[PDB]
Design a protein around this ligand. Structure first.
Ligand SMILES: [Mg+2]
Ligand SMILES: [Mg+2]
Ligand SMILES: [Mg+2]
Ligand SMILES: [Mg+2]
Ligand SMILES: [Mg+2]
Ligand SMILES: [Mg+2]
Ligand SMILES: [Mg+2]
Ligand SMILES: [Mg+2]
Ligand SMILES: [Mg+2]
Ligand SMILES: [Mg+2]
Ligand SMILES: [Mg+2]
Ligand SMILES: [Mg+2]
Ligand SMILES: [Mg+2]
Ligand SMILES: [Mg+2]
Ligand SMILES: [Mg+2]
Ligand SMILES: [Mg+2]
Ligand SMILES: [Mg+2]
Ligand SMILES: [Mg+2]
Ligand SMILES: [Mg+2]
Ligand SMILES: [Mg+2]
Ligand SMILES: [Mg+2]
Ligand SMILES: [Mg+2]
Ligand SMILES: [Mg+2]
Ligand SMILES: [Mg+2]
Ligand SMILES: [Mg+2]
Ligand SMILES: [Mg+2]
Ligand SMILES: [Zn+2]
Lengths: 51, 220, 73, 98, 97
RNA sequence: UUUUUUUUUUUUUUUU
RNA sequence: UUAAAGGAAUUGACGGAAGGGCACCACCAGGAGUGGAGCCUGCGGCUUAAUUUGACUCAACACGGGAAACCUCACCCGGCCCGGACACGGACAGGAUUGACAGAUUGAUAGCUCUUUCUCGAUUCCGUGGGUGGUGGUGCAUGGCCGUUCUUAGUUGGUGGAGCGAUUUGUCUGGUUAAUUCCGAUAACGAACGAGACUCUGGCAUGCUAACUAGUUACGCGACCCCCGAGCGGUAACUUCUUAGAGGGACAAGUGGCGUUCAGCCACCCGAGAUUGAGCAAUAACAGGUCUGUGAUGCCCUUAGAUGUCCGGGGCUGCACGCGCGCUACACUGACUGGCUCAGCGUGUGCCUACCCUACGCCGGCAGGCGCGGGUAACCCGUUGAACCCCAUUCGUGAUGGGGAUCGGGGAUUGCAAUUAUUCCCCAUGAACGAGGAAUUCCCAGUAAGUGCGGGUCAUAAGCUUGCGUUGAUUAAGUCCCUGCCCU
């Protein structure tokens, strides 16, 4: 069987959001993986402030 | 053989706090779940769950807290009982807005019209020491068009800095056969100078003075 | 958009495999009413051929479990 | 369409040991997630636990990518279905408290 | 032997540092001061909106990372006693020999 | 000093 | 033939109506421009097998953080897979359920199908149902979020008067302010949100705090210069520069003038600064946008020959065209070549699931390579030796050496794959373009503008965007004509 080809070790396919398995909108790299949609929901939990 | 940077370890800790808190609010929605305080010790990691019905948390034999104690271990890899969970009884039930919206949800599921339920939770919150409160319910209520409803009692602050430590935001969803209902509860905590009840910094507008000093002052 | 689909039928119903056998499959031969005769070849020892036999073919010799193939000119 | 035969008894053994099963939604085809507890990756974990959550043997929770599996006293009434095989043992969550 | 206090907020940082100095200086411990490492600022800027309509409107998030170093050259037996403090949950401690 | 026109229907109401 | 026409009266809205004000998304005085050329990139229209789709004045058009070689991907073309949970029932193979070598077949080394026949050990399989999944439809069924009305000062109830009532009075004649900001008058009385007050940052500073992950002065050793106790850089105490905590410091306080007992305004001394930049941000709405952020979701649609899912190509890039945001330019205040010379944010590896930053030496003309070393960081890159600028050379008004697209040939480098797009470099080719018509945008002091760097995307990766700096003007400090707003 061939379910899996296409190494997927890099690029847009390997990037997966930690919150809702999203890959389309870009995902940051600060030790963190979000959507930028659900990051606004969770910044108040993970401890970012605006100032 | 493992260490990461101070720049990334803080945001990893924050993602851990958010993951833990929203898993506990996604499966502890039955009783009154308020929140957590996560304490770290190089021998043991404590998780305090501020909740309303600790009877439902202990359960039959002390079962559910030990089940979720195994749960928290089996994904974050802190074995051997290094992570210890405790639950705490929230004394002021009506003061936690997350608790009050969560109490409003299970009423609004089983019948219990929006007017009666909202006035019932507002009178309870205003009786429970609150200086001011606001409950907003949006959704398909008695029609096809999205008629939003607002309910304001007392004294509310919207702008400026001390919103972020005076106003406790509670935003929840309710699934019904009509669709979804979004609820927003925000409660201005009273200023109590000492204790766990409200915040300890006064309002910068509300300025207190002392009453007059004395009287007698004549020469000898 | 509002696209509409149909079968063009340039690729007919090719069936999934309906496994064909005999009613039972009789393998072993008894000689002299008590001596065992085995008609078919045995797989070599790669932890398969102890109780697993080979397949007959035009030129090949196939092992069922571990896919060992022997073939000779 | 089955697992190996050791797979079913091993994953029910893990459930009967801990009382807690945990996996993630990543369904084995673009990438190969393995459970750190076992050998078999994740697809067979899903197919084994969906039979429990369908019949009502094990309750389900979902979080951010992951499945957590929860056990009720009705869940213990069908832990009796696992207790078909061994002698009478409770998984080490319900039993004792110090 | 040095101790690195890396904390989440400035007030709990100052309070645990003051407690450490007050629990240090009654002994005969020569203490190097609470040296201030400079503040790291991890910034994330966000489009604020799930779909691109309206005015271009950006978040501006910050965290402040604070860090104090204190040097306590001693036998490590005293440092084991120094470690035992009911410490605030927003403070991280490193010890280095 | 100018400077005119711009489909057609889409819009219902509570108990304490 | 029609279910209203109409009368007073209230609140909006609007007025090329009047009074009073405000704003560079408005103007004046100016600057840089854009619109003209080439190119990068979105959009419409063509073409297409498909050129996936949303948004269309501000309030869409470098926007979906949309920079696509495939994955992404939602669209075509072709080929696999069940992840058919779970009940009841059918065969139940007298146990035979799937997995596969070889050959044909197919891009395939797909047991997909056919030839062939070993394995597989009660999960199947067939069906009746139910169910699962969906970047399918519907943002005019919805939640959450965001934007806008609306960067202006507005908004609301309790009691009381006015009126049958809709409502009003508070919320105002006047003075003042960026402001419903205050003083005052007063059928209103006390009140609340908003503005401020608040949080961050900027500037000053103590000779408080105190520093081998930052320095400085001294004191040495040490190299050279002259040699004359000197001078330039290598290896005992104090914090001024470096970092960051507590605190202080600026309030129209002092003077004078204009001011109604005022509210406050103007000018000036002293100061570091006579106020800087943001954040947050009301009541009520749009039938604004997102079902393509979600395991947030209703209903519909599809569910085994699938609209699920992989897998292989192709594509969103395809060009007679019109439009938007931009980059490079149109040269002498300049290009070329050498020399000299100073930054600041902040980023960097075995990461909750897949990931570096570079020092040194040697090879190569360059892009690059090879060994070696450091950095999980005030420790190393890195006293970030940046560009602009400055000094010197050449060019001399010429489509010139300005201009660098077009494109021939080659060489590195990422990658699984660059061809109908990577990217970088060398040689060659050397177009339009002569400061831009109608019109329009943006802008008041470290400001516009020139210039480079860091981050986001990433492997390769900026002309985009977002922060940082660096050099640093002109003209206002005013009005309501034009655009538009607030109060009678
Ligand atoms: Mg709404
Ligand atoms: Mg006409
Ligand atoms: Mg009239
Ligand atoms: Mg002008
Ligand atoms: Mg230009
Ligand atoms: Mg042009
Ligand atoms: Mg198109
Ligand atoms: Mg809408
Ligand atoms: Mg729509
Ligand atoms: Mg909506
Ligand atoms: Mg609409
Ligand atoms: Mg009356
Ligand atoms: Mg009125
Ligand atoms: Mg100092
Ligand atoms: Mg507003
Ligand atoms: Mg979904
Ligand atoms: Mg496109
Ligand atoms: Mg054009
Ligand atoms: Mg624009
Ligand atoms: Mg040139
Ligand atoms: Mg020329
Ligand atoms: Mg224009
Ligand atoms: Mg230039
Ligand atoms: Mg970049
Ligand atoms: Mg980058
Ligand atoms: Mg971009
Ligand atoms: Zn997510």
């Amino acid at each position: 069987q061939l379910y899996w080809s296409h190494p997927r070790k890099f690029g847009q396919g390997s990037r997966s959001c930690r919150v809702c398995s999203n890959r389309h909108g870009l995902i940051r790299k600060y030790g963190l993986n979000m959507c930028r949609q659900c990051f606004r929901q969770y910044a108040k939990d993970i401890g970012f402030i605006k100032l | 053989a493992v260490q990461i940077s101070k720049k990334r370890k803080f945001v990893a800790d924050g993602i851990f706090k958010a993951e833990l808190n929203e898993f506990l609010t996604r499966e502890l929605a039955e009783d009154g779940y308020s929140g957590v305080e996560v304490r770290v010790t190089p021998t043991r990691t404590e998780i305090i769950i501020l909740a309303t019905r600790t009877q439902n948390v202990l359960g039959e034999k002390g079962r559910r807290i030990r089940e979720l104690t195994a749960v928290v271990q089996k994904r974050f890899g802190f074995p051997e009982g290094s992570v210890e969970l405790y639950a705490e009884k929230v004394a002021t039930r009506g003061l936690c807005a997350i608790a009050q919206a969560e109490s409003l949800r299970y009423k609004l599921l089983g019948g219990l019209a929006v007017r009666r339920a909202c006035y019932g939770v507002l009178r309870f919150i205003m009786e429970s020491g609150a200086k001011g409160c606001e409950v907003v319910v949006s959704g398909k209520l008695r029609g096809q068009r999205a008629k939003s409803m607002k309910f304001v009692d007392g004294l509310m602050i919207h702008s400026g800095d001390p919103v972020n430590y005076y106003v406790d935001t509670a935003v929840r969803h309710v699934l019904l056969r009509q669709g979804v209902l979004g609820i927003k509860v925000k409660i201005m905590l009273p200023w109590d100078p000492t204790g766990k009840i409200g915040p300890k910094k006064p309002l910068p507008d509300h300025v207190s003075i002392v009453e007059p000093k004395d009287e007698i002052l004549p020469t000898t | 958009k509002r696209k509409k689909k149909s079968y063009t039928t340039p690729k007919k119903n090719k069936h999934k495999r309906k496994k064909v056998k005999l009613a039972v499959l009789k393998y072993y031969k008894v000689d002299e009413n008590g001596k065992i005769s085995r008609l078919r070849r045995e797989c070599p020892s790669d932890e398969c051929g102890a109780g697993v036999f080979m397949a007959s073919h035009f030129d090949r010799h196939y092992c069922g479990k571990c896919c060992l193939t022997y073939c000779f000119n | 369409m089955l697992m190996p035969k050791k797979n079913r008894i091993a994953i029910y053994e893990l459930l009967f040991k801990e009382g807690v099963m945990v996996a993630k939604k990543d369904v084995h085809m673009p990438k190969h997630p393995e459970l750190a507890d076992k050998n078999v990756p994740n697809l067979h974990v899903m197919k084994a636990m969906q039979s429990l959550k369908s019949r009502g043997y094990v309750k389900e929770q979902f979080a951010w990518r992951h499945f957590y599996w929860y056990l009720t006293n009705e869940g213990i009434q069908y832990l009796r279905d696992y207790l078909h095989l061994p002698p009478e043992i409770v998984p080490a969550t319900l039993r004792r408290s110090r | 032997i040095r101790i690195t206090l890396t904390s989440r907020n400035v007030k709990s940082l100052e309070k645990v540092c003051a407690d450490l100095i007050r629990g240090a200086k009654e002994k005969n411990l020569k203490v190097k001061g609470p040296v201030r490492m400079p503040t790291k600022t991890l910034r994330i800027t966000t489009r604020k909106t799930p779909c691109g309509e309206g005015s271009k409107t950006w978040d501006r998030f910050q965290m402040r990372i604070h860090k104090r170093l204190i040097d306590l050259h001693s036998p490590s037996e005293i440092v084991k006693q120094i470690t035992s403090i009911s410490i605030e949950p927003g403070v991280e401690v490193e010890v280095t020999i």
